[PDB]
Design a protein around this nucleic acid. Structure first.
Lengths: 44, 117, 149
RNA sequence: CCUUGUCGGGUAAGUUCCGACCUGCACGAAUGGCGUAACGAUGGCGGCGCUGUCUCCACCCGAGACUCAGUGAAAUUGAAAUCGCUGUGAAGAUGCAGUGUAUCCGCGGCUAGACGGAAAGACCCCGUGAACCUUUACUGUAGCUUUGCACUGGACUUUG
RNA sequence: AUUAAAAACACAGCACUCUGCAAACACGAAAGUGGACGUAUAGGGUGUGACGCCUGCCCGGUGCCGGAAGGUUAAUUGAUG
RNA sequence: GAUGACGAAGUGGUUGAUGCCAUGCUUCCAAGAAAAGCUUCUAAGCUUCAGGUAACCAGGAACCGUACCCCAAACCGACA
RNA sequence: GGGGCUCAAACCACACACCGAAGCUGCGGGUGUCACGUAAGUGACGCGGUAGAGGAGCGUUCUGUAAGCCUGUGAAGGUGAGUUGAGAAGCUUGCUGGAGGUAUCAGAAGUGCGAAUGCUGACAUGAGUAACGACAAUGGGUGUGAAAAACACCCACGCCGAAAGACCAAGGGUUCCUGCGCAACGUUAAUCGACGCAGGGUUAGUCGGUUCCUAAGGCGAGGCUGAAAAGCGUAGUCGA
RNA sequence: AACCCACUCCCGUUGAAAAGGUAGGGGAUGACUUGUGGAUCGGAGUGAAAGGCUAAUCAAGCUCGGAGAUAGCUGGUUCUC
RNA sequence: GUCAAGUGAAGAAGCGCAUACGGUGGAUGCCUUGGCAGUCAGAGGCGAUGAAAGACGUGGUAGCCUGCGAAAAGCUUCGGGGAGUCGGCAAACAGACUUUGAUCCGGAGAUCUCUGAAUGGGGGAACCCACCUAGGAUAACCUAGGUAUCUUGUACUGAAUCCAUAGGUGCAAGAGGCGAACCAGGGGAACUGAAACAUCUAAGUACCCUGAGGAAAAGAAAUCAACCGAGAUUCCCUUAGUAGUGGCGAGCGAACGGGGAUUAGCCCUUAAGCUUCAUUGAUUUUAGCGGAACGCUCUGGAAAGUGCGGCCAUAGUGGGUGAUAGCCCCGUACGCGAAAGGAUCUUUGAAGUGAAAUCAAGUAGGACGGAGCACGAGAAACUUUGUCUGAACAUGGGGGGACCAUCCUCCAAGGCUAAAUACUACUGACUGACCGAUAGUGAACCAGUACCGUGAGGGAAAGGCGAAAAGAACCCCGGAGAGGGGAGUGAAAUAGAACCUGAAACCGUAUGCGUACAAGCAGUGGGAGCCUACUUGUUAGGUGACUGCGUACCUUUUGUAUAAUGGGUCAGCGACUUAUAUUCAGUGGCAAGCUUAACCGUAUAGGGUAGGCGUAGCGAAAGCGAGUCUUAAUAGGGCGUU
């Protein structure tokens, strides 16, 4: 009975990290929406 | 112009819950049960203003009946004298004279044994 | 702000039907008939303003609330000089209606607590039914009859 | 389907089973036909052994239950001073009517009722609701294909 | 996955059909890629489902394959009225 | 109940791996990573000092992680 | 309907009484309409009510009247009592409150809640009920302590022992250790703790990474392609 | 045996657990089990095929917009005479 | 006394009701350092001179905010200010700095680590590894610069290939990124409405994408008009919901002509205009300075309030001071003021640009297929064009809604142009019949936080002591507890920090009465006894033995006690609004007239009568008019009419 979150700091950064978001246009506007909302982290 | 309704709603709950004073349980202390209970108590209070006039009319008649059969006459023979004689005296004070002034009630039932009709 | 998705599924949850966190029933939600900036300006006919002024001036005469002077001018721009001249008329809480408001008469009496200095054009239904006396000059009743008669 | 067809076997007795018969409602030869060793947490039958499955439960051992100490929930809930019966009644009553019972209050148990609790019935109907699938429904359309004209030329001939 | 582990699916074997290679086919507005750095004993698709004995009749309907060349038929052309 | 000083025997025969020889051998088809370090060859180049190869001598090897938990009360499961 | 009833408390007639409705009458109460009244004023007929139409109001907050009036000799608010009105509701007052309030008459509305399996918070009931997380197992002594079934040590007894033992990667992030603590957290108590507060603690040429190299795959100068965004990709250069 | 599975019983169903446990059971040198990194995604993948699976969600994920969709339906709509 | 019988007051484990206090809880009222919406202005961008957004560091205590950046709550300079200061949560304490002028406030400069377009190369953002040149350093480094790509320009170099093209290399110059809307374009839904749906609608909306600017686009007639004329564009008001258009359904919707806002047209024989500098005066902005006039008295903790008397006023309904202040304080009216920058306007030069070359050819026109014009290809004009074609040349050519003639009016295929207009993330000032902690921003408070998700994303709750901390020395019980009892403090501590008010549900203690042989919506009519206050009793409050009648409420229904729905309860919140058109009623102003819209306005005034409706109808219409139609028929009816 394993669950859906199996943590890995390497897979977290290559899917959701900052370079990954700013590599593509649709994620480069995740980072601007998430900065327009004024969030503390903007890459989690 | 915003208006908050906490001062008017608590004085309106406190009127209906003062009229509920003396009621068992949540009928006297929560509003949804006390509003219904004060409405019901004023439906009954309306109804029983009519029955009070009926319950005393039965009690007068029952004591006049009981005090007439002391003198050898029923209720309906005592009342029957007075489409022929005329005392014009009512059930309220004949019941009060059957109990209290028992000799002045014997004088009325002999005027009704004088009518014979 | 917010309340896009439904808070729970439509059935099965034993909970009353919701469609947003921001319903007007919910304490986060919007006012149901929320205000927007609107105007409360309304239309008087031009004949109807004039007939209502002409009905007010008639009652200012009839109640002795209208006091006509030959001319009304102060020389210095000074409130003390105009208090001292209204006191010669037995007069406080006044409307002063001139034909044209001069500059010293405006600089005096614009601190003074219960007077106004209007011209005839700038007189209005409320401010000559509000002050306990109205001073018009003789030049003002000429201008009131150019407008109303 | 009729149907537990009929006959044989197995049982004391067998709608299942086995072997037959052919009267195949409504088998049939690559939506394969009929067999078939081995295989199977496969379906149905029968036997041996074994037994608390059962006649029919008895005793025993641990963990709860029960009691005391400490901590401390939940679904539910209009309000409750919350009986039986027989009638009545939006047609199956703790509450109406009539009448019998019945001192007041727990605890342990048992679940007949409270049309008990749980999920705005899943069946059924409804809606000029939805979705998804189908096609020889309607209307389209991607794709494939045909020809005209472009890109696109000359040079003889069959040919008009 | 979380009520169905089976007789369902897969399978080896079998057949049918497509495909001559810049292959059929598939993903792509397209370049490109996969098939495949393979080449008909190969690859795709369909159906049956070890093996043994076998797989009858029907080409009307519908599909597919081939066929004359007649009739009907589209844009285009623009005679004549 | 801590620490400073002293402190004895320490050999032999058996049985042995799932460890090592072994990335070895034998056999089978389904036919079994790349690239660098490394070894070597020359090119373009060199003054044929630089460069190379041994020897001797002297010095150096930066940065980051390191506690603790892992058949879990420290991870994934709202929970010791 | 029950008790119970038999020259009836039954049925059939007739006579006379009586009881019985919010009906009717007596008596006291608004204006609903209408007619009269030079508008005091009495009369007459009404007055159950859902959907619904009409008519009249009360109360709340705000603005004008309001630089007014009230109020620290005590506002709003809260809690009582008394009183008045057909009603919504008003007025007066005791206590609490400790700084505001708004006669009247107009103006504006976030204007009146018990229901929407409403929404938020608080709080009941169930109920001091069920449970307290594997049925390895605990029993004494001593200590400390405000208090020990649970902490420390001691003597026993059980349990695991291809782990309930030792490690590594991952993942976490100080949980490690010591002194002081026990509110909260710990399914009880706790002096104990993975809890609080403060100090300390992690030392590398050789162990792991970086650095070197590549796989899948990603990016990709130019380039090819595509309404745009972009897709694909060569050289390359990332990626254990 | 480990390991991976999940046929049967019972318990558990407010659970120790949003799918477990105990006793038995299947595979266990293979079409095996598994770590780490990667590839494919919403009329779209993936599927030894069950409409299965695509983060406890799947006859079309999640999230935010169109958007206060629409609802001839449901429920509710607050002072007095 | 005894025995029989009859009668029954006390004795409540617990419950009910009332009252009195108390707890829980946080309502209400009052409040505000926070929001919300306007009006008037500002300036409309930031960034390779390294932005938005950050990571990490920076302090005597040191966490998090705010500042800063290894020069790190700051360093140098001017200018201002004049007595205190070392930012805030956060009060204290250390060690200090300041009249030889600190802190603070503006202008200018210096520093400015790491990430981020991120730009030397990589990468899992805040990390890793380098190279080149110059200088300095003892087998280790250090300092100051360079090192991205693409575009354009330029120099040098040179493949197949002879020439020179491609390519290579170096230099200059520029670009990239971010931002709430506004703008020009590219691509473009669907639910929905039509009471189904497909044409159509929704709607060229949402959304994605690309550019530009402080505005943008548009714009100087191949434009409209009817034989009269008007002259760019954009914007508002009307024409008018009219003409048209449309499964002629739902719907969509002009123009002519008027009224306004604004006011410029220049050129392709080279121009206005605009950018960059350099200057000429001027005006603003970035901080400040001066800034009038009240005492006594009363109550009180405290006076601004009371009572009396004054004063000031270009300053009187400001903020807060121990209760309500024109004269206490800070302001306000009103005057003044700038070392140094910024910005606007203006002189008068300069380099540019506009600028495409020379009045427009693959263009106008046409045929197919689309799209637009309000116009669903329709008699369809006009405009755009994906495919195919294809002119005339001022004794031309286009338009005037199929088309043809005649008139009228214009010159397409080159351009550039201000103002009126749109918007507000950001500043500032004023304002509100806006909100007042369940409200108003999600956010008054360390909020886009905590928390939930792998992620995009979702997204809270939480204000109030007092005037002043005067925040409770000391004593006592307790575990050097928690929490209390005193004493102090204050006006008040039942203002003691969870702190103003302190409601209701809910939970208690005390007291009075009722209740253990009596059946059910829990009340109501009658009613004894008992108990409290009072005064007379024929009262007032509490309790209510006993008894008559009595099956909650909502919703939904022909009907519900219904065993039909909904509600555990309390407190807050929660549902007929607003805009624009229109009709009817009431109430008003004017009246055969009435009323204005944009806009103007020293601005609720006044102007502005474009328009709208009325005074005349009938007809499909020309038209005729107190009258048409019809038919050869003024012959016969419908509509209107003082």
């Amino acid at each position: 009975m394993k669950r859906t979150f199996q943590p890995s700091t390497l897979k977290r950064a290559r899917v959701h990290g900052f370079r990954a978001r700013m590599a593509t246009k649709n994620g480069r506007q995740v980072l601007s929406r998430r900065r327009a909302k004024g969030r503390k982290r903007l890459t989690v | 112009a915003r208006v908050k309704r906490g001062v008017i709603a608590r004085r309106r709950h406190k009127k209906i819950l003062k009229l509920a004073k003396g009621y068992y349980g949540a009928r006297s202390r929560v509003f949804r049960v006390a509003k219904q209970a004060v409405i019901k108590a004023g439906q009954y209070a309306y109804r029983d203003r009519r029955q009070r006039k009926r319950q005393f009319r039965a009690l007068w008649i029952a004591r006049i009946n009981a005090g007439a059969r002391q003198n050898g006459l029923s209720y309906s023979r005592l009342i029957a004298g007075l489409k022929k004689a005329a005392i014009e005296i009512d059930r309220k004070v004949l019941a009060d004279l059957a109990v209290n002034e028992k000799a002045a009630f014997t004088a009325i039932v002999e005027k009704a044994k004088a009518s014979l009709a | 702000s917010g309340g896009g998705k439904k808070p729970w599924r439509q059935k099965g949850t034993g909970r009353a039907r919701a469609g947003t966190i921001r319903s007007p029933i919910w304490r986060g939600g919007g006012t149901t008939f929320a205000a927007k900036p609107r105007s409360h300006e309304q239309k008087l006919n031009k004949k109807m303003y004039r007939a209502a002024l002409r009905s007010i001036l008639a009652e200012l005469v009839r109640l002795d609330r209208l006091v006509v002077v030959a001319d009304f001018a102060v020389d210095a721009p000074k409130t003390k000089g105009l208090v001292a001249k209204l006191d010669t008329l037995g007069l406080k809480d006044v409307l002063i209606v001139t034909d044209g408001v001069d500059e010293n008469l405006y600089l005096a009496a614009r601190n003074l607590a219960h007077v106004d200095v209007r011209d005839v054009q700038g007189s209005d239904p409320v401010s000559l039914i509000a002050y306990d006396k109205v001073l018009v000059t003789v030049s003002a009743v000429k201008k009131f009859e150019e407008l109303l008669g």
